[PDB]
Design a protein around this ligand. Structure first.
Ligand SMILES: *[C@@H]1O[C@H](CO)[C@@H](O[C@@H]2O[C@H](CO)[C@@H](O[C@@H]3O[C@H](CO)[C@@H](O)[C@H](O)[C@@H]3O)[C@H](O)[C@H]2NC(C)=O)[C@H](O)[C@H]1NC(C)=O
Ligand SMILES: *[C@@H]1O[C@H](CO[C@@H]2O[C@@H](C)[C@@H](O)[C@@H](O)[C@@H]2O)[C@@H](O[C@@H]2O[C@H](CO)[C@@H](O)[C@H](O)[C@H]2NC(C)=O)[C@H](O)[C@H]1NC(C)=O
Ligand SMILES: CC(=O)Nc1cccc([C@@H](OP(=O)(O)OC[C@H]2O[C@@H](n3ccc(N)nc3=O)[C@H](O)[C@@H]2O)P(=O)(O)O)c1
Ligand SMILES: CC(=O)Nc1cccc([C@@H](OP(=O)(O)OC[C@H]2O[C@@H](n3ccc(N)nc3=O)[C@H](O)[C@@H]2O)P(=O)(O)O)c1
Ligand SMILES: *[C@@H]1O[C@H](CO)[C@@H](O[C@@H]2O[C@H](CO)[C@@H](O)[C@H](O)[C@H]2NC(C)=O)[C@H](O)[C@H]1NC(C)=O
Ligand SMILES: *[C@@H]1O[C@H](CO)[C@@H](O[C@@H]2O[C@H](CO)[C@@H](O)[C@H](O)[C@H]2NC(C)=O)[C@H](O)[C@H]1NC(C)=O
Ligand SMILES: *[C@@H]1O[C@H](CO)[C@@H](O[C@@H]2O[C@H](CO)[C@@H](O)[C@H](O)[C@H]2NC(C)=O)[C@H](O)[C@H]1NC(C)=O
Ligand SMILES: *[C@@H]1O[C@H](CO)[C@@H](O[C@@H]2O[C@H](CO)[C@@H](O)[C@H](O)[C@H]2NC(C)=O)[C@H](O)[C@H]1NC(C)=O
Ligand SMILES: *[C@@H]1O[C@H](CO)[C@@H](O)[C@H](O)[C@H]1NC(C)=O
Ligand SMILES: *[C@@H]1O[C@H](CO)[C@@H](O)[C@H](O)[C@H]1NC(C)=O
Lengths: 292, 292
């Protein structure tokens, strides 16, 4: 049914590149920050600051981790409940490169979402919510194991979007410095990039207070992928094909009720409408049904 | 009326020294920890750990700051509301060396508590209560100025008593590293010393889960002071003479003062009884009334 239009996608890549230097915005590098430099937060009041320490700078890459990288078929996997029972795991894992959002689980869900991960995003407040601020030996060990499972994947850590990241970023930084060289995980640390990313999408008549992680991933992916297939983008409470109730997230327990006010800060429906148009124009393949 | 018994005090000093190496226990030093060493907490479950970083080690003194120090008259100033209207400021400031507790304010209270400070203690959670975790420029500036007012005094920071210190300690460390050489404050960082300090006081029929900061100060002071005068030790909500309501702290008097189970922390009444016996034996002078 769906047919890729390579030319139109590459024109979209060029248009994104005119508004966002993706290669650079992908991560701060050692030489782009000074020790003692005060960072601000893209989505918090300007009064919030974070001072760049020696240790933080030592975790930055020397060069963009996506410089001169090229992947043919990319999967960007959002977190919609539409993936549950899709059996898309195998097809996602055939991709050259898979992006995942917010350290999403794969273990109990591989048949549907895959086990391949080449990048996953990581808001530092994950440490507070799921790893008890790395306070105990067992917390530390659980986090270490989760990192080890990523192998050489990129962990894309946006520490300068929300001021609530500030204290937990120091804990994260200390852990990584303490374990330097023990893990193959490639760290990436984007800076204040949402002002640049928002410019491309304002032109496409999309102006939320906040763009979603999913669409941020598409934006990055545009620069390094030749063809992008989207999974788990479907911000609605029902299945499009069956009409049955659907959870918001694929990892939600069965029967969990789609939450209306979960997504009041986002404009996922407007994002989705725009991706859906893009699907129709052959720019990207939006998957909304079970895979083969 | 009160008369110092030098002989009995010297016998107390010698006894304390046989159970606690005060000079060593006063502070961890650079060479007494390794980078990557896991610290445990004296008053928390053993599962809680804190990994010693490069930066933390860099804030440790090379040698115990009290090594070979000897002061004649020391004042140890607890934080009781009994100091309010005592006019003990001048008498406290005549001491050769003054110890204060938990970074207690002196500016608005000098007539009663003095302006002299040679050491003050600092639970790191002070940053969370009074300096908003150093999240803004104004918070950072306030904390800096409070530090600058200490001049070359010792800031005695027990980061390894309560696991709840862990995350704020990283904030504190980052601030001090960031501002290295800008302040004259001498940092001291005691480690796991409460097991040793408790041994002397167990023999004196005092066995709380936790000895108070005030009595810990007495213990330290015994090694470096010829004579110790106590002020602001009075763990009761009432004036000793009138029985009228008294604030728990001299600085936290007027205002909608949240009243909780602050008493359940410490066995302060038993400490106070013991200090009161000691006063009677001429070991130390416990002041419970106006100075002028
Ligand atoms: C994210 O990417 C944006 C661009 O999409 C980065 O901003 C751009 O940074 C470049 C430097 O790499 C600026 O180039 C400069 O052009 C000016 C003319 O205005 C010239 O005077 C300079 O010599 C330099 O060549 C460019 O102005 C700037 N664009 C915008 C819109 O600000 C931004 O730094 C990236 N941020 C991160 C954190 O990677
Ligand atoms: C990069 O991928 C293109 C597209 O591949 C097809 O679509 C993918 C999503 C996936 O389903 C692939 O298995 C498909 O082949 C490749 O172009 C195709 O090459 C094949 C095999 O050599 C050829 O027979 C097809 O007709 C081509 N299809 C299209 C639509 O052009 C391309 O070769 C890939 N390049 C590299 C170096 O990996
Ligand atoms: C309370 C709260 O966390 N809200 C909230 C609301 C919407 C999205 C998100 C985060 O995204 P996640 O739910 O982890 O989902 C990953 C991505 O998947 C997409 N998504 C998710 C669920 C869904 N039913 N349909 C979708 O399209 C969307 O593009 C989203 O960014 P964010 O974006 O980091 O902020 C968080
Ligand atoms: C929830 C909480 O913090 N509780 C709590 C309860 C009692 C004391 C303290 C702390 O002491 P502060 O109140 O800062 O006072 C400093 C010292 O002064 C003494 N003190 C204080 C008030 C008072 N009314 N009588 C006293 O004898 C006591 O020896 C105490 O250790 P800590 O001890 O760091 O733990 C804290
Ligand atoms: C791929 O997409 C491009 C761009 O949207 C298509 O090229 C356009 O074709 C229409 C035909 O109505 C013309 O009006 C435009 O002027 C063309 N624009 C450009 C920039 O070329 C192209 O037809 C699409 N390809 C397929 C195979 O459907
Ligand atoms: C993308 O990530 C996956 C891991 O999820 C990488 O695939 C693994 O590659 C190693 C080393 O060759 C194999 O031994 C594993 O069996 C592969 N795992 C899976 C799940 O397929 C893959 O190489 C990465 N791709 C990149 C960086 O292009
Ligand atoms: C506090 O002082 C005590 C001595 O009063 C030290 O305890 C000694 O520690 C060593 C090894 O670290 C043991 O082999 C000795 O047997 C210990 N003596 C006693 C009486 O237990 C203690 O190390 C000091 N701690 C700190 C952090 O300074
Ligand atoms: C104890 O601390 C006080 C400061 O609180 C020291 O006294 C200051 O000494 C300086 C420099 O000699 C004078 O200019 C100040 O006027 C003094 N201030 C006050 C308030 O007295 C004192 O020297 C310290 N004592 C010891 C023994 O270290
Ligand atoms: C000093 O204290 C000792 C020890 O308890 C005692 O023998 C001596 O009489 C005391 N001196 C006085 C009260 O002057
Ligand atoms: C200790 O202080 C007292 C009280 O002022 C004083 O008389 C005595 O000489 C002092 N001892 C010294 C300085 O050695």
């Amino acid at each position: 049914k769906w047919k890729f239009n390579r030319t139109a996608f590459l024109h979209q890549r060029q248009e994104i590149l005119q508004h966002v230097d993706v290669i650079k915005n992908f991560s701060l590098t050692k030489n782009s920050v000074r020790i003692g430099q005060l960072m601000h937060y893209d989505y918090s009041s300007h009064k919030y600051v974070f001072s760049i320490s020696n240790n933080f700078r030592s975790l930055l890459p020397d060069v963009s981790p996506i410089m001169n990288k090229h992947y043919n078929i990319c999967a960007v996997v959002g977190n919609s409940g539409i993936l549950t029972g899709s059996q898309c795991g195998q097809e996602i894992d055939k991709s050259d490169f898979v992006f995942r959002c917010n350290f999403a689980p794969t273990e109990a869900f591989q048949r549907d979402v895959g086990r391949k991960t080449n990048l996953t995003t990581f808001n530092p407040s994950i440490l507070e919510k799921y790893y008890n601020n790395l306070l105990t030996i067992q917390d530390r060990n659980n986090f270490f194991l989760s990192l080890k499972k990523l192998d050489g994947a990129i962990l894309w850590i946006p520490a300068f979007f929300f001021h609530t990241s500030a204290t937990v970023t120091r804990t994260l930084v200390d852990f990584f410095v303490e374990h330097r060289g023990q893990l193959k995980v490639q760290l990436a640390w984007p800076g204040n990039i949402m002002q640049h990313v928002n410019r491309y999408w304002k032109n496409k008549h999309l102006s939320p207070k906040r763009l979603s992680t999913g669409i941020l991933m598409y934006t990055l992916a545009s620069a390094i992928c030749e063809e992008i297939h989207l999974y788990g983008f479907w911000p609605f409470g029902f299945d499009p094909n069956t009409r049955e109730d659907l959870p918001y997230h694929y990892y939600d327990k069965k029967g969990t009720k789609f939450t209306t006010k979960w997504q009041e800060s986002h404009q996922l429906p407007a994002e989705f409408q725009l991706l859906y148009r893009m699907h129709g124009e052959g720019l990207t393949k939006l998957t909304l049904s079970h895979c083969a």
